[PDB]
Amino acid sequence: AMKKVEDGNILVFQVSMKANKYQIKKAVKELYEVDVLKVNTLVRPNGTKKAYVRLTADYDALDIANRIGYI
Amino acid sequence: AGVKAYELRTKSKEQLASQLVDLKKELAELKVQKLSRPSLPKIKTVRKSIACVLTVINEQQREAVRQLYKGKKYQPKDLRAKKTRALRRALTKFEASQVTEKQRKKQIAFPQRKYAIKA
Amino acid sequence: GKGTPSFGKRHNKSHTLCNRCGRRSFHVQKKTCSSCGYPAAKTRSYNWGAKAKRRHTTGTGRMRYLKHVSRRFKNGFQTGSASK
Amino acid sequence: GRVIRNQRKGAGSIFTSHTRLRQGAAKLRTLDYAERHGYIRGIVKQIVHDSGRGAPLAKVVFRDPYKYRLREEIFIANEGVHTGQFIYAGKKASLNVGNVL
Amino acid sequence: AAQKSFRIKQKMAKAKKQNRPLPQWIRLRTNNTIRYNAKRRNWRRTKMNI
RNA sequence: AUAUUGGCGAGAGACCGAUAGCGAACAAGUACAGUGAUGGAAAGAUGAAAAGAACUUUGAAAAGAGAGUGAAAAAGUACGUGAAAUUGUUGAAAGGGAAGGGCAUUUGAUCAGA
RNA sequence: GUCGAAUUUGGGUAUAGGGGCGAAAGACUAAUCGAACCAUCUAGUAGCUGGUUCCUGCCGAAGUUUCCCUCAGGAUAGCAG
RNA sequence: CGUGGAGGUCAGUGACGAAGCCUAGACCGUAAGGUCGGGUCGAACGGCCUCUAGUGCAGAUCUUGGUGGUAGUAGCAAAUAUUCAAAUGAGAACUUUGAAGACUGAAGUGGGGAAAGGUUCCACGUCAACAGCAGUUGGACGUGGGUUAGUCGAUCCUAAGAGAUGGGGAAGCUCCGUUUCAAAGGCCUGAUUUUAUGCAGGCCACCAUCGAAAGGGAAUCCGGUUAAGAUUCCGGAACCUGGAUAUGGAUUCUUCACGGUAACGUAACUGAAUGUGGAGACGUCGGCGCGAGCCCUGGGAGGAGUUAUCUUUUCUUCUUAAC
RNA sequence: GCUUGUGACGGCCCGUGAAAAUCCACAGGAAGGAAUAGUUUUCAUGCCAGGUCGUACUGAUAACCGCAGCAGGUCUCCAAG
RNA sequence: CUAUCUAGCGAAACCACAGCCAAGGGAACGGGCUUGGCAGAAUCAGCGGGGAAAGAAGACCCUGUUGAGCUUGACUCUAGU
RNA sequence: AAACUUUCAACAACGGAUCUCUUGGUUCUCGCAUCGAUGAAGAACGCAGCGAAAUGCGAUACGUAAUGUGAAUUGCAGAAUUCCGUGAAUCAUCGAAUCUUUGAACGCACAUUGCGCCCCUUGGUAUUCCAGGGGGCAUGCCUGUUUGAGCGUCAUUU
Ligand SMILES: [K+]
Ligand SMILES: [Mg+2]
Ligand SMILES: [Mg+2]
Ligand SMILES: [Mg+2]
Ligand SMILES: [Mg+2]
Ligand SMILES: [Mg+2]
Ligand SMILES: [Mg+2]
Ligand SMILES: [Mg+2]
Ligand SMILES: [Mg+2]
Ligand SMILES: [Mg+2]
Ligand SMILES: [Mg+2]
Ligand SMILES: [Mg+2]
Ligand SMILES: [Mg+2]
Ligand SMILES: [Mg+2]
Ligand SMILES: [Mg+2]
Ligand SMILES: [Mg+2]
Ligand SMILES: [Mg+2]
Ligand SMILES: [Mg+2]
Ligand SMILES: [Mg+2]
Ligand SMILES: [Mg+2]
Ligand SMILES: [Mg+2]
Ligand SMILES: [Mg+2]
Ligand SMILES: [Mg+2]
Ligand SMILES: [Mg+2]
Ligand SMILES: [Mg+2]
Ligand SMILES: [Mg+2]
Ligand SMILES: [Mg+2]
Ligand SMILES: [Mg+2]
Ligand SMILES: [Mg+2]
Ligand SMILES: [Mg+2]
Ligand SMILES: [Mg+2]
Ligand SMILES: [Mg+2]
Ligand SMILES: [Mg+2]
Ligand SMILES: [Mg+2]
Ligand SMILES: [Mg+2]
Ligand SMILES: [Mg+2]
Ligand SMILES: [Mg+2]
Ligand SMILES: [Mg+2]
Ligand SMILES: [Mg+2]
Ligand SMILES: [Mg+2]
Ligand SMILES: [Mg+2]
Ligand SMILES: [Mg+2]
Ligand SMILES: [Mg+2]
Ligand SMILES: [Mg+2]
Ligand SMILES: [Mg+2]
Ligand SMILES: [Mg+2]
Ligand SMILES: [Mg+2]
Ligand SMILES: [Mg+2]
Ligand SMILES: [Mg+2]
Ligand SMILES: [Mg+2]
Ligand SMILES: [Mg+2]
Ligand SMILES: [Mg+2]
Ligand SMILES: [Mg+2]
Ligand SMILES: [Mg+2]
Ligand SMILES: [Mg+2]
Ligand SMILES: [Mg+2]
Ligand SMILES: [Mg+2]
Ligand SMILES: [Zn+2]
């Protein structure tokens, strides 16, 4: 996930199993003041949901991660 | 030491909603921290504070609705008394004390008397 | 055949998980749980199956409302607050 | 001591007719006013094989007398009936092969 | 089956999460008659039967 | 007034004492078996207190030998006691196709009584 | 043996126990079939087989009579305490 | 005679050691048994008078558990087959690498999938148990990482069939039946716009739903990328559906296009109800034609092999997706 | 030549070898329509969105079933000289 | 390729106690008993005479006032008609 | 004579009997009457700083609120020791709440975390399309309301 943040401009989140791509996109936008280019989701083998949130080219996911507290 | 319900109860619903939002932000940043820091028990306090603020908000909302529905029949079912289902189906005190005019007359005329044997 | 070679052809489940009891007794083709009788309204049980009744009866779960009904009766189904 | 085969046939589990490929029930037109009093002309569109049946069927299209539409009927083809032939059904239809009288 | 229903995947997730040895700080508790995970499952020994 | 192998709360016993007593004294209707209906165990005890063996030494290690704790390690979590079957070592004895036994005495060993 | 059609086979589906299904062997119906499996009635009944747990002391048999749907059993008399 | 429990009693025994257990040591009794010494042990137990019973085991192909001889025995012999060296390691027939020899020989011992499994995938650590030898290795053990879709599936459709409702049967659990003896209807709009609805104009109904990860079906490809994901990620390039929509184009002065004899053509080129038609949509075998990929092969531009001799030679790259 | 796709045909049947969703077209002519201008999202370009669940791996002489790491059984695609 | 021997690994059947004969008698075919013959540790590979070897409460036969499958103008009934 | 076999003893094994324990069972007696559409019993899945279970709980998730007590919890970590206090606690009590997905289970389905419809509201020009938030839509039956149907039928106009 850290490689994805640094290289692919993609924030990796654990999200609610009830949340869909629209809810994930609007929640990321609201919580982090960031435009979202795309959301991919999978259900992990441990029963949680993982969202790859690719941000638009305007924002740098590495600095977004730095701001929200994980480098 | 976490929030106290008696301190929250003196606050308006706007202040309580704001405090809930801040507590949610704090919990989010705390679970971010937990990923690096091992054994971070401080998140339990914020979780209980969020629970307490939600409890007080719901208390205020439900009290306002009780005030809205005071006195009139047909309260909302989750504000009505939850006795058992059979107890809510049972006859009220007015019913089951209803008596016919004939029965009222005859039991007024001949009640059980108080009498002792004195030899 | 009929023994080891025929046991190799066992890859189609006659029963899957039952929505009501979760036992993997929901017959796929009959659409009926062989354990709890779902989707019948009544829960399947029999007096010849005393052990099964014991397995699935009240108290085998957490009882989640009924575990407090008794205390509420003891206190007379009160409705207010404890009033410090 | 066992239920015999002719007894088992009545339950109709594996003894039902294999009707998947069949064209439909072979019937005359519903006996209506037009056939009760005059005649109605339809046209033979197809003479087709029916699965499980020896005799071929004729799909005869009549006009609906009460609604603007066509009514297809599945007749059993009589010998000599051909496609494009006008079939006449009713009290007043002519004594011709394929007519319903 | 690699084309599985969510119900099956959810039971699989629960099984994966509970497929672990006993937490070793248990066995330090005051009375603790618990010695080991007696409900440990393994794919080679006992089938989940869904 | 009568019933009550269910529920809730109590008091008891010439009852059972872990192969007993409910199947279940324990994470028991659990683990596990069966497609399924169903079937369904085993499993309690260091010590007052972990004081659960610091440290040295041999060993790759497991462990051993010491040291030590403890009233006790002939209590070391493979833990109260620790039978028998069966087994090792030591000691004694006998033994040409079984062994064991009865009566009697020799021999060896051992022992009470006055 | 057979191997291009009364062919082989997957999946779906239907038929359930005196019931099904059978190109018919009483075959098959989940290693179960001349009546599946599960639980209960049920600790079913058994004139039949096996077993039936301490010591010493005293006494001490019968396999015969009659009757029985009786002949591996019982009642009855006899023998015994 | 002995055992579990009970009333009474011996103000019985006992942490200075109860019970239990072991003991070719002693004593008493014909015996059932009783008593003592020694060792072990650790918390209770006994004599007598009575009470009571789930009260005495060698057997029951007895029940549960444990243990033998057999016995270091039978055996660990199908699937052609292994060998050398180095590394690692305490330890190597079995691990890793290299070298060699072989096999599967494309109806594979290859590459993928369906059912099923469920993390077995991958990495790191790691060998007590398991891998019927071994093990440093593993589908094991311990800790983690990992499955990214508008276009691939499910989702939708109906198939054999399953199955509510309306009704009928049945004491009843429930059974029949699936469009039937039912008052089973929403989607359109003149007007209403006291509000796009109710009244109020008018058009269509012999009917739930479930049933296919191989049937039908809207639409995505190539290259690259990971320890482990890829038609899903990245780059580029498309497409379909639903919607919103403004320009350009087209059309109209003969309003809803022109051309061609025609088959038909096109950048467009109004079209409600209703009806009709087509596609979806279909067996199997045979030969023939054509395409694609593969096979074979010539020249040429590269790389590799053999070269005592011969071989302008042997092997290999030369590709082009959806749209 | 092999694999496969396909076309036009031919043989066979007392066998003539699904259904529905869905899409299109036609018939019709309701209605709506132009001249300091009306019409046309079946022509071109342009804008937005496309949710949910599955997706790893094995698929077998060791990942399924057969008590197991069992010479058994278990559907299918590709296929060089 | 086994068997064989070795390193490692390591079961099971079965087992009253056991294991040399001849005759005798005996429940009429003894490993034990009687009378004789005899008889010397511990063993390995084979072997199939014996252990009336093992496997299974004989499936044949009989008995039981034990069944079941099937049949029939057995007795007694019954759905249907 | 060893080895070997057998018997006994001691020590050591194997094994778990015996003895003594007992928060368990069993039986008897006494008292009480309280599940559920205000969604029960049961199920699935989650929730803790470090838990797989048991137990508890439900996205307010080993719990929130209220009350009482009065200083803990404890395996570690952390916090705290104001703790002369509206205040510790895995405490007790419990009247207020929360109560995922379900389940008689209720919009339609369910081998699908599948598919609708209505209302309010928010965003994307947006009554119509998409999305987010909130609230709803089962059946039978009863009383009542409203809107209706039938030449079943009364009266009036006619
Ligand atoms: K029989
Ligand atoms: Mg996805
Ligand atoms: Mg069979
Ligand atoms: Mg089936
Ligand atoms: Mg027990
Ligand atoms: Mg013990
Ligand atoms: Mg001691
Ligand atoms: Mg011990
Ligand atoms: Mg012994
Ligand atoms: Mg025969
Ligand atoms: Mg008996
Ligand atoms: Mg005498
Ligand atoms: Mg008689
Ligand atoms: Mg006899
Ligand atoms: Mg007793
Ligand atoms: Mg003692
Ligand atoms: Mg002895
Ligand atoms: Mg003690
Ligand atoms: Mg007894
Ligand atoms: Mg015994
Ligand atoms: Mg005996
Ligand atoms: Mg025995
Ligand atoms: Mg045994
Ligand atoms: Mg051997
Ligand atoms: Mg062999
Ligand atoms: Mg071989
Ligand atoms: Mg190699
Ligand atoms: Mg070969
Ligand atoms: Mg070869
Ligand atoms: Mg691996
Ligand atoms: Mg091994
Ligand atoms: Mg080993
Ligand atoms: Mg692992
Ligand atoms: Mg598709
Ligand atoms: Mg039905
Ligand atoms: Mg469907
Ligand atoms: Mg398909
Ligand atoms: Mg892959
Ligand atoms: Mg892309
Ligand atoms: Mg033009
Ligand atoms: Mg082919
Ligand atoms: Mg894959
Ligand atoms: Mg694969
Ligand atoms: Mg393969
Ligand atoms: Mg297996
Ligand atoms: Mg002899
Ligand atoms: Mg003789
Ligand atoms: Mg003998
Ligand atoms: Mg002799
Ligand atoms: Mg000898
Ligand atoms: Mg032999
Ligand atoms: Mg022999
Ligand atoms: Mg016999
Ligand atoms: Mg027999
Ligand atoms: Mg008789
Ligand atoms: Mg009979
Ligand atoms: Mg609830
Ligand atoms: Zn169920």
Q: Which range marks the domain in which residue B81 is found?
A: 74-119
The answer to whether D80 CB sits below 7 Å from nucleic acid chain J is: no
Cβ neighbours for A51, distance < 8 A, ≥ 6 positions apart:
A12, A13, A14, A15, A21, A24, A39, A40, A41
- Regarding whether B86 and B31 lie in a shared domain, the answer is no
Cα-atom radius of gyration of chain B, to the nearest Å? 28
3-class DSSP state of E28: coil
Q: Give yes or no for B63 touching A (CB within 8 A).
A: no
Rounded Cα distance, E9 and E36, in Å = 27
Determination technique used: cryo-EM
Whether the CA torsion D72, D77, D82, D85 is positive or negative: it is negative
Rounded Cα distance, B61 and B12, in Å = 11
Rounded Cα distance, D83 and D63, in Å = 17
- Regarding whether B7 and B55 lie in a shared domain, the answer is yes
Quick one: which of B26, B62, B61, B67 has its CA closest to B47?
B26
- Regarding whether B37 and B52 lie in a shared domain, the answer is yes
Q: Are C26 and C15 in contact (CB under 8 A)?
A: yes
- Regarding whether B80 and B23 lie in a shared domain, the answer is no
Q: Give yes or no for A70 touching B (CB within 8 A).
A: yes
Number of helices followed by number of strands (H, E) in chain B: 5, 0
Residue C47 corresponds to which tokens in the numbers above? 């007096």
Quick one: which of C35, C32, C67 has its CA closest to C52?
C35
Rounded Cα distance, D81 and A64, in Å = 83
Say if E and B touch: at least 3 Cβ pairs within 8 Å: no
Q: How far does the CA of D67 sit from the C1' of H185, in Å?
A: 20
- Regarding whether B91 and B69 lie in a shared domain, the answer is no
Whether the CA torsion B89, B94, B100, B102 is positive or negative: it is positive
- Regarding whether B116 and B83 lie in a shared domain, the answer is yes
- Regarding whether B68 and B19 lie in a shared domain, the answer is yes
Residue C71 corresponds to which tokens in the numbers above? 């205390």
The CATH code of the domain that includes B78 is: 6.10.250.3450
Rounded Cα distance, C31 and C17, in Å = 11
Task: Work out the minimum CA distance from E13 to partner chain A, whole angstroms.
Answer: 5
- Regarding whether B60 and B10 lie in a shared domain, the answer is yes
Task: Check residues 6 to 45 of chain E and report those whose beta carbon is under 7 Å from nucleic acid strand H.
Answer: 8, 12, 15-16, 19-21, 40-44
Task: Work out the minimum CA distance from A46 to partner chain E, whole angstroms.
Answer: 5
Rounded Cα distance, A17 and C32, in Å = 30
- Regarding whether B97 and B82 lie in a shared domain, the answer is yes
Our CA dihedral for E10, E16, E18, E21, rounded to 10 degrees, sits at 180
Rounded Cα distance, A4 and A62, in Å = 9
- Regarding whether B57 and B27 lie in a shared domain, the answer is yes
Cα-atom radius of gyration of chain A, to the nearest Å? 11
Q: Which amino acid is at D35?
A: E
Determine which helix (DSSP H) or strand (DSSP E) holds C27, and give its type and residue range: strand C26-27
Residue C12 corresponds to which tokens in the numbers above? 């189609």
- Angle CA E29–E30–E33, to nearest 5: 75
Provide the CB-side half-sphere exposure for C58 (13 A, CA).
5
- Regarding whether B59 and B17 lie in a shared domain, the answer is yes
How remote is the C-alpha of C37 from its chain's centroid? 9
Q: Are strands C26-27 and C15-16 parallel, antiparallel or unpaired?
A: antiparallel
How remote is the C-alpha of E35 from its chain's centroid? 16
- DSSP readout, chain A? -HHHHHHH-EEEEEE-TT--HHHHHHHHHHHH---EEEEEEEE-TTS-EEEEEEEPTTS-HHHHHHHHT--
Which residue has tokens 């107890």? Answer: B87
Report DSSP state, residue D89: E
Cα separation values, B119 from B111, B112, B116, Å: 24, 21, 9
Which residue has tokens 């010998």? Answer: D79
Q: How far does the CA of B100 sit from the C1' of K58, in Å?
A: 52
Cβ neighbours for D15, distance < 8 A, ≥ 6 positions apart:
D8, D9
Using H for helix, E for strand and C for coil, what is the string for E7-23?
A: HHHHHHHHHHHHCCCCC
Residue B77 corresponds to which tokens in the numbers above? 């079912």
Resolution in A: 2.0
3-class DSSP state of D44: strand
**Residues facing residue D87 across a β-bridge:** D42
Residue C34: exposed, middle, or buried by beta-carbon count in 10 A (0-12, 13-18, 19+)? middle
Q: Residue B28's CB: how many other CB atoms inside 10 A?
A: 14
- Regarding whether B110 and B55 lie in a shared domain, the answer is no
Rounded Cα distance, B60 and B12, in Å = 9
Q: Residue A54's CB: how many other CB atoms inside 10 A?
A: 16
- Bases on strand G under 7 Å from any protein CB: 10-16, 18-22, 24, 26, 28-32, 35, 39-40
Gap from CA of C41 to ligand 54 centroid (Å): 51
Which residue has tokens 């014991």? Answer: C54
Q: Are A34 and A40 in contact (CB under 8 A)?
A: no
Q: Are A46 and E17 in contact (CB under 8 A)?
A: yes
Cα-Cα end-to-end distance for chain C: 79
Our CA dihedral for C29, C30, C33, C38, rounded to 10 degrees, sits at 120
Largest distance between two CA atoms of chain D = 62
Rounded Cα distance, D58 and D78, in Å = 8
Cα separation values, B92 from B87, B89, C78, E2, Å: 9, 9, 17, 61
Largest distance between two CA atoms of chain C = 79
Query: How many domains would you assign to chain B?
Result: 2
Which residue has tokens 């007015």? Answer: B94
